Design an enzyme around this catalytic site. Structure first.
Site, PDB file in Angstrom:
ATOM      1  CG  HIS A  26      -0.143  -0.380   2.413  1.00  0.00           C
ATOM      2  ND1 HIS A  26       0.367  -1.598   2.075  1.00  0.00           N
ATOM      3  CD2 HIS A  26      -0.335   0.466   3.344  1.00  0.00           C
ATOM      4  CE1 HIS A  26       0.782  -1.553   4.289  1.00  0.00           C
ATOM      5  NE2 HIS A  26       0.358   0.319   4.340  1.00  0.00           N
ATOM      6  CB  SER A  50      -1.759 -10.759   0.339  1.00  0.00           C
ATOM      7  OG  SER A  50      -2.658 -11.180   1.073  1.00  0.00           O
ATOM      8  NE  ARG A  54       2.442 -41.702  -2.553  1.00  0.00           N
ATOM      9  CZ  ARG A  54       2.412 -43.240  -1.172  1.00  0.00           C
ATOM     10  NH1 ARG A  54       3.197 -41.899  -0.390  1.00  0.00           N
ATOM     11  NH2 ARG A  54       2.292 -44.414   0.049  1.00  0.00           N
ATOM     12  CD  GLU A 111       2.114 -26.782   5.198  1.00  0.00           C
ATOM     13  OE1 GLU A 111       1.639 -25.942   5.822  1.00  0.00           O
ATOM     14  OE2 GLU A 111       2.191 -27.867   5.094  1.00  0.00           O
ATOM     15  CD  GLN A 113      -3.434 -35.815   7.541  1.00  0.00           C
ATOM     16  OE1 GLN A 113      -4.730 -36.601   8.459  1.00  0.00           O
ATOM     17  NE2 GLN A 113      -2.845 -35.231   8.723  1.00  0.00           N
ATOM     18  NE  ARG A 122      -0.935 -43.125   2.314  1.00  0.00           N
ATOM     19  CZ  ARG A 122      -1.199 -44.626   2.582  1.00  0.00           C
ATOM     20  NH1 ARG A 122      -2.344 -44.939   2.324  1.00  0.00           N
ATOM     21  NH2 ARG A 122      -0.264 -44.831   3.800  1.00  0.00           N
TER      22      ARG A 122
HETATM   23  C1  LIG Z   1      -2.803 -10.410   4.326  1.00  0.00           C
HETATM   24  C2  LIG Z   1      -3.804  -8.034   4.826  1.00  0.00           C
HETATM   25  N1  LIG Z   1      -5.204  -8.232   5.813  1.00  0.00           N
HETATM   26  C3  LIG Z   1      -4.900  -7.201   5.901  1.00  0.00           C
HETATM   27  C4  LIG Z   1      -5.334  -6.358   5.145  1.00  0.00           C
HETATM   28  C5  LIG Z   1      -5.243  -5.126   5.195  1.00  0.00           C
HETATM   29  N2  LIG Z   1      -5.035  -3.573   5.781  1.00  0.00           N
HETATM   30  C6  LIG Z   1      -3.871  -2.846   4.491  1.00  0.00           C
HETATM   31  C7  LIG Z   1      -4.778  -2.773   3.380  1.00  0.00           C
HETATM   32  O1  LIG Z   1      -5.171  -3.612   3.173  1.00  0.00           O
HETATM   33  C8  LIG Z   1      -3.628  -2.314   1.957  1.00  0.00           C
HETATM   34  O2  LIG Z   1      -3.109  -3.020   1.677  1.00  0.00           O
HETATM   35  C9  LIG Z   1      -5.765  -1.742   4.030  1.00  0.00           C
HETATM   36  O3  LIG Z   1      -5.652  -0.228   4.403  1.00  0.00           O
HETATM   37  C10 LIG Z   1      -7.248  -1.262   2.646  1.00  0.00           C
HETATM   38  O4  LIG Z   1      -6.874  -0.420   1.507  1.00  0.00           O
HETATM   39  C11 LIG Z   1      -8.147  -0.461   2.792  1.00  0.00           C
HETATM   40  O5  LIG Z   1      -9.226  -0.454   2.587  1.00  0.00           O
HETATM   41  P1  LIG Z   1     -10.265   0.341   2.492  1.00  0.00           P
HETATM   42  O6  LIG Z   1     -12.084   0.186   1.718  1.00  0.00           O
HETATM   43  O7  LIG Z   1     -11.191   0.428   3.833  1.00  0.00           O
HETATM   44  O8  LIG Z   1     -10.155   2.387   1.842  1.00  0.00           O
HETATM   45  S1  LIG Z   1      -2.620  -2.145   4.860  1.00  0.00           S
HETATM   46  C12 LIG Z   1      -3.055  -2.044   6.700  1.00  0.00           C
HETATM   47  C13 LIG Z   1      -2.957  -1.918   7.647  1.00  0.00           C
HETATM   48  C14 LIG Z   1      -0.693  -2.323   7.665  1.00  0.00           C
HETATM   49  O9  LIG Z   1       0.006  -2.424   8.787  1.00  0.00           O
HETATM   50  P2  LIG Z   1       0.996  -1.985   8.521  1.00  0.00           P
HETATM   51  O10 LIG Z   1       2.619  -3.068   8.646  1.00  0.00           O
HETATM   52  O11 LIG Z   1       2.187  -1.323   9.928  1.00  0.00           O
HETATM   53  O12 LIG Z   1       1.717  -0.445   7.229  1.00  0.00           O
HETATM   54  P3  LIG Z   1       2.094   1.136   7.343  1.00  0.00           P
HETATM   55  O13 LIG Z   1       1.017   0.876   6.853  1.00  0.00           O
HETATM   56  O14 LIG Z   1       2.301   1.201   8.909  1.00  0.00           O
HETATM   57  O15 LIG Z   1       3.100   1.339   7.011  1.00  0.00           O
HETATM   58  C15 LIG Z   1      -3.769  -3.461   6.681  1.00  0.00           C
HETATM   59  C16 LIG Z   1      -4.430  -4.559   8.095  1.00  0.00           C
HETATM   60  C17 LIG Z   1      -4.054  -6.763   4.026  1.00  0.00           C
HETATM   61  N3  LIG Z   1      -3.746  -5.609   3.331  1.00  0.00           N
HETATM   62  N4  LIG Z   1      -3.072  -7.564   3.464  1.00  0.00           N
HETATM   63  C1  LIG Z   2       0.265 -28.028   7.722  1.00  0.00           C
HETATM   64  C2  LIG Z   2       0.596 -29.792   7.139  1.00  0.00           C
HETATM   65  N1  LIG Z   2       2.003 -29.996   7.336  1.00  0.00           N
HETATM   66  C3  LIG Z   2       2.360 -31.093   6.568  1.00  0.00           C
HETATM   67  C4  LIG Z   2       2.156 -32.473   7.153  1.00  0.00           C
HETATM   68  C5  LIG Z   2       2.156 -33.576   7.403  1.00  0.00           C
HETATM   69  N2  LIG Z   2       3.492 -34.462   8.765  1.00  0.00           N
HETATM   70  C6  LIG Z   2       2.580 -34.789   9.641  1.00  0.00           C
HETATM   71  C7  LIG Z   2       1.335 -36.305   9.121  1.00  0.00           C
HETATM   72  O1  LIG Z   2       0.562 -35.857   7.939  1.00  0.00           O
HETATM   73  C8  LIG Z   2       0.836 -36.828  10.070  1.00  0.00           C
HETATM   74  O2  LIG Z   2       0.336 -35.837  10.378  1.00  0.00           O
HETATM   75  C9  LIG Z   2       2.383 -37.383   8.413  1.00  0.00           C
HETATM   76  O3  LIG Z   2       3.549 -38.154   8.771  1.00  0.00           O
HETATM   77  C10 LIG Z   2       1.580 -37.913   7.509  1.00  0.00           C
HETATM   78  O4  LIG Z   2       0.805 -38.885   7.953  1.00  0.00           O
HETATM   79  C11 LIG Z   2       2.429 -38.734   6.255  1.00  0.00           C
HETATM   80  O5  LIG Z   2       1.838 -40.021   5.934  1.00  0.00           O
HETATM   81  P1  LIG Z   2       2.027 -40.561   4.724  1.00  0.00           P
HETATM   82  O6  LIG Z   2       0.746 -41.464   2.989  1.00  0.00           O
HETATM   83  O7  LIG Z   2       3.118 -40.973   4.017  1.00  0.00           O
HETATM   84  O8  LIG Z   2       2.054 -42.318   5.551  1.00  0.00           O
HETATM   85  S1  LIG Z   2       3.478 -35.311  10.478  1.00  0.00           S
HETATM   86  C12 LIG Z   2       4.761 -33.874  10.040  1.00  0.00           C
HETATM   87  C13 LIG Z   2       6.400 -34.189  10.676  1.00  0.00           C
HETATM   88  C14 LIG Z   2       5.805 -33.228  12.302  1.00  0.00           C
HETATM   89  O9  LIG Z   2       7.342 -33.468  12.787  1.00  0.00           O
HETATM   90  P2  LIG Z   2       7.270 -32.781  14.256  1.00  0.00           P
HETATM   91  O10 LIG Z   2       6.115 -30.981  14.357  1.00  0.00           O
HETATM   92  O11 LIG Z   2       8.641 -32.722  14.857  1.00  0.00           O
HETATM   93  O12 LIG Z   2       5.997 -34.188  15.224  1.00  0.00           O
HETATM   94  P3  LIG Z   2       6.936 -35.265  16.005  1.00  0.00           P
HETATM   95  O13 LIG Z   2       6.365 -36.532  14.827  1.00  0.00           O
HETATM   96  O14 LIG Z   2       8.816 -35.417  16.030  1.00  0.00           O
HETATM   97  O15 LIG Z   2       6.539 -35.500  16.985  1.00  0.00           O
HETATM   98  C15 LIG Z   2       4.979 -33.415   8.607  1.00  0.00           C
HETATM   99  C16 LIG Z   2       5.083 -32.589   7.882  1.00  0.00           C
HETATM  100  C17 LIG Z   2       0.576 -32.224   8.396  1.00  0.00           C
HETATM  101  N3  LIG Z   2       0.865 -32.853   8.861  1.00  0.00           N
HETATM  102  N4  LIG Z   2       0.095 -30.532   8.602  1.00  0.00           N
END
Ligand SMILES: Cc1ncc(C[n+]2c([C@](O)(CO)[C@@H](O)[C@H](O)COP(=O)(O)O)sc(CCOP(=O)(O)OP(=O)(O)O)c2C)c(N)n1
Ligand SMILES: Cc1ncc(C[n+]2c([C@](O)(CO)[C@@H](O)[C@H](O)COP(=O)(O)O)sc(CCOP(=O)(O)OP(=O)(O)O)c2C)c(N)n1
Ligand SMILES: [Ca+2]
Ligand SMILES: [Ca+2]
Lengths: 620, 620
Positions: B76, B123, B317, B365, B427, B473
């Site tokens: 912005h 964003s 896969r 991710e 999953q 899978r």
């Molecule tokens: C992921 C995410 N979440 C929230 C926001 C909203 N937002 C911002 C704007 O989206 C601008 O990019 C917002 O101002 C809109 O223009 C408003 O639209 P209207 O229709 O109401 O006019 S900017 C913002 C606040 C950021 O603060 P700082 O990071 O401190 O930056 P600075 O301005 O102080 O330097 C928010 C919450 C967005 N965009 N993305």
């Molecule tokens: C947001 C997010 N991203 C990635 C993963 C995958 N993941 C986990 C599982 O999803 C289990 O919840 C994974 O093991 C699947 O069962 C595998 O499926 P298969 O078909 O291959 O058998 S668990 C995991 C690793 C987490 O490590 P730690 O946080 O250190 O936990 P610990 O086990 O060491 O205690 C990943 C990457 C998920 N689920 N969510």
């Protein structure tokens, strides 16, 4: 209550418990042929101490509102959660062996069909945010004595959502919340980045405002002691553990995440573990102080009908804030959350009137949704989250998991479509109907004026599942009488005549463009029927088809949204194969750009003139 | 090159520059009637120093591969980005006044139709991850001298994605990356949590492995000095600033975010600012060292046809990982990224063969997608990201913004549908077709066997936009000859006879269930036509309708996905109103549960027996 400093016999019983939990996790995952016993085993002492020394809960009533809460953020350790609830006497021990079967509810990751589970957590990094909502509720809404405990993995700590929750907890002084970090060195496919650099974990937690304690995660005594002191801050117990602890030759090794022991191996390892257990006698759970208040369960009704006037102009975003504030006067259960957008979404109106029930979530949409889910658990509150609809895409996995959690949360996304004008596509929600329609428990409201918006807020409050209300930035006319009845799955015919040639379905700004198109077409002696869906999901298929049969089978849908997954596709799926029925779509075909609202509606083919042209081409 | 320590005249010129940038930001947003001048003004000295002392770039060729990169994460502040590029001589100064007009490309937030913009950032919280991808590319792939600079807001730092990027940069030793934090105390609707607690920002950055320097963000000298030393770590310049700096009576005040000055006010403030400018003479940009290598732009071809055998079994896969590794031998441009899932997605095969081109992104991710976007900028690499398809929902806003960024990235999501079996719904990807179809630049591949998977990888590599490959899978049979030709938007009829009664459209596991249904139905003397879409987006409407006309107009779609936004809805939208055409859908109607793959296909109504029953009911 004072800490009860355990004797050597109690400590030995907690060790015995931990080892029983290991054996069960191995037995269950070997029986299933899948699961994560090494992830269970690193957590066994933590689980034993939490469930059989620290926490207070009713073992026969896991959902009881007075209970301490436990959130298993590392949800793939589900077998050890099931094992503790069998050890506590709630689950039958034989049922543990039915892990992951279609005949059981002991599913691969925890889910709320289990009485002992509040939120589903299998997508990593989300449990701490739900725990924060529970803790916030405990401290500020329920004003109760229960504590909240959340167990995380170390790999899991790479998720940004965790750090949003970390920051939230220190902003809001959640001194009733404890995070336990299972620092077992390893993730799924490699060591976690920081491995056993315990001091860096401590530095990170402290920098985010937590009181951080490093412990030996396999010492029941150290765990009892660390869990036994309350602090004036959220507390992180940073537990140094070994993955696969107690499994000889697997402990601390790669290539074992999510791999069950074969049967031959399980038998040998189990005998080894069992040889370490001193007594079969189990420890009993200890019950909570019963100081959580009554919450009423009744329908929440607006205190009066809407008080708009037909022909006045208001943006549906403004009507949302007005309606939410109004509803907050009718019930104390309503809470509002927003992500630094309250002056754009108009949730600021609620904050002004009901400040104790507004939660500022800052620019952290993931965490905001998780806070709402946590606040809604055990029906303690009725939350309404808001931001720009576009920024709910940041929280889609939290929303997805909210449906798996059977959560009742309400989400209002403002600034939909190109009609926002000058900010450009980053702010424009063009995929939010696709996203929310794909959420299985969802109800999707798209109110077209201020009256419909107020009615949508009231209906959402009283509707189970994931409710989404799509609001719009620009001002449009009030078209409905205040006493118009609105219902989920009931559309409205807002313009009709006996010689209508097309049924035009629009919503929000495109409804108003369709009404303007009708005025254009009148000049040409062409009448169109205009239909406002009200809910996009569920869709009033009956009224749509009855309309289309009155208009030579012809339907035209027009939407401020991309083509895929929105109104046009919903209507097409509803009616495809109906004889005599045709459906033509107008929507936004590509990423937009900045300009005035009316200019963009024109550029992207969804304004009055585009509608009028599509109607003429149908007729001819 | 040595630091050039500026004299007082150069410092004054940088102050003058900062003030010119303030005036332009005010003039442009006042002219537009919208925008964020107070967010520009806090950053004016930072921008002046970066563009006119620190960075090295070709002012007439902003996309030049040798240039330092600048990422405006706080998008912005776009008016001040436009102003620096006018000050540098690339943009005409008169064009600045056309901010946000439909007649201009100076849109509300930066977008890559601007030569000086690589990624779109509106964003919040995403720019640092893209910057990390640029820096990683500079250090490890290009092995070039350019540096990467990313300007963030303070409110923005609440986004978890920022902290994922913070951690990535220290893991990967990105000592060519600088983050500038505009700590102006305020967000949109309230003070940022930490306000001017500069020491806590420093503690957070240092805990995440950065070298952190607190500066007066309105001191050009302090900025020159802080930017002028390289470090052996990613460096955070933590700049204490005031929002609206230089706007008398607005500086440091609430209620001014995203509010333009009225015209009367702008004139008075501009005269005040202009009275501080000592000279009109502008500073010139300084050019870069030209050490970025040549990258080839040619088609990437597999080195041989697939070498599968009809009737052998492989999971798609696994075929993905095999195909990606194979493609990596044909071209050095291919890189692979994965989020601690390489042993599940089979991206580990690429890592084994091409380790220098694999990026472990850990359980993050959001950041993974942003890294890929950054690596793809200026066509430096061809990235393939992978995780479970379900976990791409965590990154939807990054994906959405990738399309607004016109990015060419490839995403492979494994573990689709209920056919994963025992892990349960956390999953299971059941909404990924809805999500990716709603992304405007997307191509959605759903390969049904190993041959189709290899061909999808090759086609994706050579296709612009957001390419998604949905992998599965379980193991299924190879059904295609290795020399079968595959194309985007071309389906395959895999079973036909002259007396086919229904056209059944399936994909992945449901294609194989449809083939098994056909064998069941044969017993009954009922033939069905079976069609494999290959791409879900774009859909081969011609073959689908030609098929349906051969099968009494009847289409049955069957998918391991929710009803909304998937294959059935795509087909319905494509064909609705075609005379004689009917479409019936089988899909997953609710959140699933754990069980064996075949058991879940049965429970959720998408296996061979469900298909056979739907076919019989059509016919009758
Ligand atoms: C992921 C995410 N979440 C929230 C926001 C909203 N937002 C911002 C704007 O989206 C601008 O990019 C917002 O101002 C809109 O223009 C408003 O639209 P209207 O229709 O109401 O006019 S900017 C913002 C606040 C950021 O603060 P700082 O990071 O401190 O930056 P600075 O301005 O102080 O330097 C928010 C919450 C967005 N965009 N993305
Ligand atoms: C947001 C997010 N991203 C990635 C993963 C995958 N993941 C986990 C599982 O999803 C289990 O919840 C994974 O093991 C699947 O069962 C595998 O499926 P298969 O078909 O291959 O058998 S668990 C995991 C690793 C987490 O490590 P730690 O946080 O250190 O936990 P610990 O086990 O060491 O205690 C990943 C990457 C998920 N689920 N969510
Ligand atoms: Ca771990
Ligand atoms: Ca700020």
């Amino acid at each position: 209550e004072s800490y009860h400093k355990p004797d050597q016999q109690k400590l030995q019983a907690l060790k015995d418990t931990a080892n029983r939990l290991r054996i069960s996790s191995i037995q269950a995952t070997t029986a299933a042929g899948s699961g994560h016993p090494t992830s269970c085993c690193s957590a066994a002492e933590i689980m034993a101490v939490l469930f059989f020394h620290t926490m207070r809960y009713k073992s026969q009533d896991p959902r009881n509102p007075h209970n301490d809460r436990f959130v298993l953020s590392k949800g793939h350790a589900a077998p050890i959660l099931y094992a503790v609830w069998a050890e506590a006497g709630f689950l039958a021990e034989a049922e543990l062996l039915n892990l992951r079967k279609i005949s059981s509810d002991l599913d691969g990751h925890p889910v709320p069909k289990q009485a002992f589970t509040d939120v589903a957590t299998g997508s990593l990094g989300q449990g701490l945010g739900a725990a924060c909502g529970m803790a916030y509720t405990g401290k500020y809404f329920d004003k109760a004595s229960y504590r909240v405990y959340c167990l995380l993995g170390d790999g899991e700590l790479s998720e940004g959502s965790v750090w949003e929750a970390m920051a939230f907890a220190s902003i809001y002084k959640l001194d009733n919340l404890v995070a336990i970090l299972d620092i077992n060195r390893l993730g799924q496919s490699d060591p976690a980045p920081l491995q056993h650099q315990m001091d860096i974990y401590q530095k990170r937690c402290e920098a985010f405002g937590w009181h951080a304690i490093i412990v030996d995660g396999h010492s029941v005594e150290e765990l009892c002691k660390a869990f036994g002191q309350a602090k004036h801050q959220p507390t992180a117990i940073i537990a140094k553990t070994f993955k696969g602890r107690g499994i000889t030759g697997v402990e601390d090794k790669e290539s074992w995440h999510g791999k069950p022991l074969p049967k031959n191996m399980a038998e040998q390892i189990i005998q080894e573990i069992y040889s370490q257990i001193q007594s079969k006698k189990k420890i009993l759970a200890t019950p909570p102080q019963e100081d959580a208040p009554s919450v009423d369960i009744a329908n929440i009704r607006m205190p009066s009908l809407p008080s708009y006037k037909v022909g006045d102009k208001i943006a549906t975003r403004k009507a949302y804030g007005q309606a939410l504030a109004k509803l907050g006067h009718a019930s104390d259960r309503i809470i509002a959350l927003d992500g630094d957008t309250k002056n754009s979404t108009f949730s600021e109106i609620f904050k002004k009137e009901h400040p104790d029930r507004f939660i500022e979530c800052y620019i952290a949409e993931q965490n905001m949704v998780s806070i709402a889910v946590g606040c809604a658990t055990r029906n303690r509150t009725v939350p309404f989250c808001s931001t720009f609809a576009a920024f709910f895409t940041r929280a889609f996995d939290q929303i997805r998991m909210a449906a798996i959690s059977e959560s009742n949360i309400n989400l209002c996304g403002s600034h939909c479509g190109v009609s926002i004008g000058e900010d450009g596509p980053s702010q424009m929600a063009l995929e939010d109907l696709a996203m929310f329609r794909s959420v299985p428990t969802s109800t999707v409201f798209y109110p077209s004026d201020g009256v419909a918006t107020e009615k949508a807020v009231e209906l959402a409050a009283n509707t189970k599942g994931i409710c989404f209300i799509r609001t719009s930035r620009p001002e449009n006319a009030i078209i409905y009488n205040n006493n118009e009845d609105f219902q989920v799955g009931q559309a409205k015919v807002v313009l009709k005549s006996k010689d209508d040639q097309v049924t035009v379905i629009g919503a929000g700004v495109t409804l108003h463009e369709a009404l303007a198109a009708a005025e254009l077409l009148k000049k040409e002696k062409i009448n169109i029927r205009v239909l406002d869906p009200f809910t996009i999901k569920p869709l009033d298929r009956k009224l749509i088809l009855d309309s289309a049969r009155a208009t030579k089978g012809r339907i035209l849908t027009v939407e401020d949204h991309y083509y895929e997954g929105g109104i046009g596709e919903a209507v097409s799926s509803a009616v495809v194969g109906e004889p005599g029925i045709t459906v033509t779509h107008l929507a936004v075909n590509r990423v937009p750009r900045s300009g005035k609202p009316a200019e963009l509606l024109k550029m992207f083919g969804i304004d009055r003139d585009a509608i009028a042209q599509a109607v003429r081409g149908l007729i001819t």
